[PDB]
Amino acid sequence: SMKVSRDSKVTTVVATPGQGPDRPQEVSYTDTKVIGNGSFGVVYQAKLCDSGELVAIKKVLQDKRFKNRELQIMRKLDHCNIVRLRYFFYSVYLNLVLDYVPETVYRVARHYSRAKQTLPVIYVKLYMYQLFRSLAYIHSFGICHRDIKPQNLLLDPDTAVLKLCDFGSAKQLVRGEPNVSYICSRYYRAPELIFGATDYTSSIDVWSAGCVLAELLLGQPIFPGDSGVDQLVEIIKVLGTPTREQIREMNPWTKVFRPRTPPEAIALCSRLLEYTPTARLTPLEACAHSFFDELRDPNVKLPNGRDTPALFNFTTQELSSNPPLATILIPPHARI
Numbered sequence: 345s346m347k348v349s350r351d352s353k354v355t356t357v358v359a360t361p362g363q364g365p366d367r368p369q370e371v372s373y374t375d376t377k378v379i380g381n382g383s384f385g386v387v388y389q390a391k392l393c394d395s396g397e398l399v400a401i402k403k404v405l406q407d408k409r410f411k412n413r414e415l416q417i418m419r420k421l422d423h424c425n426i427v428r429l430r431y432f433f434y435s436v437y438l439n440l441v442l443d444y445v446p447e448t449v450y451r452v453a454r455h456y457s458r459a460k461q462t463l464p465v466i467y468v469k470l471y472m473y474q475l476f477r478s479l480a481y482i483h484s485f486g487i488c489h490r491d492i493k494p495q496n497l498l499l500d501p502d503t504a505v506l507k508l509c510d511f512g513s514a515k516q517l518v519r520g521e522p523n524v525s526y527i528c529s530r531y532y533r534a535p536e537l538i539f540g541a542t543d544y545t546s547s548i549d550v551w552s553a554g555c556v557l558a559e560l561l562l563g564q565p566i567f568p569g570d571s572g573v574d575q576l577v578e579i580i581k582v583l584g585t586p587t588r589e590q591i592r593e594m595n596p597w598t599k600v601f602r603p604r605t606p607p608e609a610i611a612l613c614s615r616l617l618e619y620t621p622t623a624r625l626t627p628l629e630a631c632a633h634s635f636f637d638e639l640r641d642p643n644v645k646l647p648n649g650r651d652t653p654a655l656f657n658f659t660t661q662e663l664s665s666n667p668p669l670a671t672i673l674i675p676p677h678a679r680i
């Protein structure tokens with residue numbers, strides 16, 4: 345139940361806070377507009393009446409038979425690199441009231457691509473590092489996103505802040521439980537998914553992140569193809585034919601990129617984009633990679649003088665996979 349009034353058309357809903365105790369809130373918003381569509385449902389941009397603050401409203405069809413998995417997952421998440429679930433309410437449709445983020449890596453990468461240019465490496469570092477942090481965080485709960493792609497990576501152009509969104513495919517992966525191989529989008533799918541594996545791990549997200557990194561470096565997807573076969577061919581052309589052992593596990597890099605591509609960017613890709621799922625860097629190990637060393641420099645600034653967003657406020661939860669990595673991850677200047 346919602347109420348409509350005119351101050352300008354105003355919608356007043358009684359919504360449940362995304363986190364904390366269930367204390368219903370009256371939320372009034374106006375100036376709604378569609379910012380995105382998809383198979384899930386629609387995404388709107390709305391303005392909160394009282395604060396003038398912009399929010400995004402993701403509205404999806406609600407199955408009465410079960411609780412929404414995306415909602416349940418998002419209610420438990422609290423990270424600087426994950427879009428925040430402020431409130432949720434019903435219309436049946438589930439409406440997720442999230443923080444509003446102006447851009448996506450997809451649109452940004454496309455602006456550059458169309459202009460035959462490349463995103464400055466400083467932004468590639470900042471975006472990728474933040475993506476790996478969000479993954480280290482979700483994976484620490486055993487949650488695999490399963491659909492990492494530029495359209496699911498939100499970004500604030502001015503603050504250089506990246507936020508992971510779209511938890512509609514996300515799932516807690518439990519050893520011994522099979523999972524569907526038909527998740528994950530064309531050009532971002534790990535080879536084990538292409539091969540039809542149901543015993544895959546969270547490392548599928550690392551492969552997808554490597555595809556995004558390579559795409560930001562190249563200006564186009566690194567493994568295109570409209571079919572699995574075409575995708576595998578593109579993969580084989582770079583990684584070489586997988587060995588019999590590599591197939592069982594799944595169940596020239598320097599020449600790939602433009603001349604002045606930093607060697608550390610290339611090395612990072614080669615460690616993300618590996619056939620053997622267990623051989624891939626974990627997100628936290630990716631964060632600690634030397635390609636991100638510039639971000640740990642005490643004098644680093646955004647091109648426009650502004651400060652970099654928060655990068656070292658790691659929690660114990662976040663570091664749980666490998667606590668000693670805090671040694672690299674938290675630079676001396678961040679330890680006061």
Ligand SMILES: COc1ccc(C2=NNC(=O)/C2=N/Nc2ccc(Cl)cc2)cc1OC
Nearest residue numbers: 379380387400427442443444445446509510
């Ligand atoms: C489900 O897909 C989502 C899409 C957008 C957002 C989103 N949250 N907060 C925002 O600001 C969002 N913005 N989305 C968006 C979409 C398109 C453009 Cl071009 C810009 C922003 C969140 C989603 O999942 C929860």
